[PDB]
Design an enzyme around this catalytic site. Structure first.
Site, PDB file in Angstrom:
ATOM      1  N   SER A 245       0.994  -1.157  -0.119  1.00  0.00           N
ATOM      2  CA  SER A 245       0.028  -0.029  -0.018  1.00  0.00           C
ATOM      3  C   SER A 245       0.814   1.394   0.044  1.00  0.00           C
ATOM      4  O   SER A 245       0.254   2.351  -0.253  1.00  0.00           O
ATOM      5  CB  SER A 245      -0.866   0.124   1.092  1.00  0.00           C
ATOM      6  OG  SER A 245      -1.768  -0.993   1.132  1.00  0.00           O
TER       7      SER A 245
HETATM    8  C1  LIG Z   1      -1.255  -2.341   2.018  1.00  0.00           C
HETATM    9  O1  LIG Z   1      -0.407  -2.540   2.264  1.00  0.00           O
HETATM   10  C2  LIG Z   1      -2.552  -3.007   2.611  1.00  0.00           C
HETATM   11  C3  LIG Z   1      -3.616  -2.071   3.339  1.00  0.00           C
HETATM   12  N1  LIG Z   1      -2.752  -1.250   4.052  1.00  0.00           N
HETATM   13  C4  LIG Z   1      -3.691  -0.618   4.924  1.00  0.00           C
HETATM   14  C5  LIG Z   1      -3.046  -0.066   6.094  1.00  0.00           C
HETATM   15  O2  LIG Z   1      -2.014  -0.753   6.712  1.00  0.00           O
HETATM   16  O3  LIG Z   1      -3.519   0.837   6.525  1.00  0.00           O
HETATM   17  C6  LIG Z   1      -4.808  -1.729   5.023  1.00  0.00           C
HETATM   18  S1  LIG Z   1      -5.268  -2.051   6.883  1.00  0.00           S
HETATM   19  C7  LIG Z   1      -6.890  -1.798   6.942  1.00  0.00           C
HETATM   20  C8  LIG Z   1      -7.456  -0.522   6.680  1.00  0.00           C
HETATM   21  N2  LIG Z   1      -7.217   0.420   7.784  1.00  0.00           N
HETATM   22  C9  LIG Z   1      -7.722  -0.789   8.719  1.00  0.00           C
HETATM   23  C10 LIG Z   1      -6.781  -0.429  10.076  1.00  0.00           C
HETATM   24  O4  LIG Z   1      -5.738   0.313   9.888  1.00  0.00           O
HETATM   25  N3  LIG Z   1      -7.197  -0.697  11.484  1.00  0.00           N
HETATM   26  C11 LIG Z   1      -8.251  -1.477  11.728  1.00  0.00           C
HETATM   27  C12 LIG Z   1      -6.373  -0.373  12.473  1.00  0.00           C
HETATM   28  C13 LIG Z   1      -7.358  -2.131   8.375  1.00  0.00           C
HETATM   29  C14 LIG Z   1      -4.483  -2.804   4.173  1.00  0.00           C
HETATM   30  C15 LIG Z   1      -3.483  -3.740   5.382  1.00  0.00           C
HETATM   31  C16 LIG Z   1      -3.344  -3.596   1.104  1.00  0.00           C
HETATM   32  C17 LIG Z   1      -2.352  -4.356   0.443  1.00  0.00           C
HETATM   33  O5  LIG Z   1      -4.133  -4.567   1.521  1.00  0.00           O
END
Ligand SMILES: *C(=O)[C@@H]([C@@H]1NC(C(=O)O)=C(S[C@@H]2CN[C@H](C(=O)N(C)C)C2)[C@@H]1C)[C@@H](C)O
EC number: 3.4.16.4
Length: 501
Positions: A245
């Site tokens: 990401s």
């Molecule tokens: C990218 O690397 C992955 C995404 N990266 C982001 C991230 O880490 O923020 C999401 S995590 C998802 C979105 N926001 C939630 C969160 O941060 N909490 C609940 C604390 C969860 C993916 C992991 C993509 C490749 O999937």
């Protein structure tokens, strides 16, 4: 009573400093003891005293001298302090001689072990800066002639043939103050999150200088006894991973430059999945329908960035990633350096177009990812990396137009400050911008960003390898490290606060 032998005149190895002249590798005068066994054979009753002064077993030392009775040169012990060497010389043992040479001392120790590297027993660079700039630091040894008897006894100096040329001082790009801060805070983050390894890279976005580069675990270069290859691994330059990401801001830069997208545009990501043949793109958070371009980064919708990638084409995204250095040679000339892989296609299929947009299929290093965010922070101008101090800033290459780069800067600032964003990355008194992510091999917690968001100066990347406490999410584990280290980096560099009421 007649044999001229050439003796090397060891050169003074060049001093290594940080960017402000703080010592990092210092050549220390030492005393090396060697012996002529032919003369020791005439004074066997002196051996147990000499063996004890050398810390050697009485009978084992006698065996070593007897086995080399016909040789004229053996080493006794290398790298003693001038006090210890003169203590053995004071014994007046026939056949014991001393050599004045130099040995490296590293005042910072494990704090900057991977960057500085180390030399071996011959004062030759074998890792890090010590090897990468070995010819610069080593100098040229000198040549002298000495007269020895046919029984190996030194008689007199004949003449000096060539004079030794000392090494040259080398000032690194590292700021030792920031290095100490990054070292401790990365170490505290691993303990709090139960993580085993990680890296942290700090960069000056205007000059391309690496202001800090720390890896965990680390090692003391002044010891290196029973040293495992895990601690010697320069992870920031060697460990490759799918950036995930963290490269979505570069897919967004291609979209904003194509002429078909604006930050207020809406993408329908419902129901959080998307079918591409047999492959199925899937977001982690699947509670969204319509999101704007900033909301795509905040939610990290792989579906949202894939649909954008289909509209603009993977070529525009590959071009931005290639020019910011992802999967490219850094030119730093460091040992064990790994390049990664940015795949290319003549005709990009739909599957590879999507995975490229949200950071799968390609592999980068923490140094490459920091370099890529440095260019975005530098108003789209990419400046080549440097582990040495930059006095004359080279003419970079305008990869992203300043308007588009400034737009992505604001979007990444909203990623950190808007509701539901990465608020643990906020720097008190400043506006910070960045993007969290996760890399897979078991996870790698990533956060890449820069500050101040409105006028960037410092880019930073935090890699945490497999948190075992709770939550492998980059916004939870790596972002708090970014906040603490960036706050200290901005203060030490006297960067004026841009978020004060
Ligand atoms: C990218 O690397 C992955 C995404 N990266 C982001 C991230 O880490 O923020 C999401 S995590 C998802 C979105 N926001 C939630 C969160 O941060 N909490 C609940 C604390 C969860 C993916 C992991 C993509 C490749 O999937």
């Amino acid at each position: 009573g007649g044999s001229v032998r050439h003796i090397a005149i060891p050169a003074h190895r060049g001093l290594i400093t940080d960017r402000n002249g703080e010592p990092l590798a210092v050549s220390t005068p030492v005393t090396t003891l060697w012996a002529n066994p032919k003369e020791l054979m005439t004074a066997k009753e002196r051996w147990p005293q000499l063996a004890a002064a050398l810390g050697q077993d009485t009978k084992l030392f006698a065996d070593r001298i007897e086995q080399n009775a016909e040789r004229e040169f053996i080493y006794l012990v290398r790298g003693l302090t001038p006090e210890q060497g003169e203590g053995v010389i004071a014994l007046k043992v026939p056949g014991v001689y001393s050599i004045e040479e130099f040995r490296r001392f590293y005042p910072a120790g494990e704090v900057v072990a991977h960057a500085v590297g180390f030399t071996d027993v011959d004062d030759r660079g074998r890792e890090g800066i010590e090897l990468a700039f070995d010819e610069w630091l080593a100098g040229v040894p000198g040549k002298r002639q000495v007269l020895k008897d046919r029984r190996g006894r030194v008689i007199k100096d004949v003449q000096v043939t060539k004079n030794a040329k000392p090494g040259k001082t080398l000032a690194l790009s590292i700021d030792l103050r920031l290095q100490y801060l990054a070292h401790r805070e990365l170490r505290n983050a691993l303990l709090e999150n139960g993580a085993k390894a990680g890296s942290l890279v700090i960069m000056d976005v205007k000059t391309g200088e690496i202001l800090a580069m720390t890896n965990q675990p680390t090692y003391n270069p002044n010891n290196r006894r029973n040293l495992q290859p895990a601690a010697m691994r320069n992870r920031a330059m060697i460990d490759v991973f799918e950036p995930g990401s963290t490269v979505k801001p570069f897919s967004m830069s291609a979209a904003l430059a194509s002429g078909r997208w604006k930050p207020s545009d809406i993408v329908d990501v419902y129901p959080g999945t998307l079918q591409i043949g047999r492959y199925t793109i899937r977001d982690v958070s699947r509670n969204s329908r319509q999101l704007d371009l900033t909301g795509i980064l905040i939610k990290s919708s792989n579906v949202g960035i894939s649909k954008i990638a289909f509209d603009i084409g993977a070529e525009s995204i590959y071009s931005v990633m290639q020019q910011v250095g992802l999967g490219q040679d850094t030119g730093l000339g460091f040992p064990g350096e790994r390049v990664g892989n940015l795949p290319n296609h003549r005709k990009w299929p739909k599957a590879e177009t999507a995975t490229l947009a949200y950071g799968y299929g390609l592999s980068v290093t923490a140094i490459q990812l920091a370099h890529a965010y440095a260019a975005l922070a530098n108003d789209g101008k990419s400046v080549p990396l440097s582990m040495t101090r930059v006095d004359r800033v080279p003419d970079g290459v305008q990869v992203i137009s300043p308007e588009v780069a400034s737009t992505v800067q604001g979007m990444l600032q909203q990623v950190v400050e808007a509701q539901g964003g990465v608020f643990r990355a906020q720097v008190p008194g400043y506006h910070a911008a960045g993007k969290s992510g996760t890399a897979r091999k078991a996870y790698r917690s990533l956060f890449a960003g820069f500050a101040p968001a409105t006028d960037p100066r410092i880019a930073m990347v935090v890699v945490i390898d497999e948190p075992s406490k709770a939550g492998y999410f980059g916004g939870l584990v790596s972002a708090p490290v970014f906040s603490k280290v960036m706050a200290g980096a901005l203060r030490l560099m006297n960067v004026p606060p841009d978020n004060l009421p």
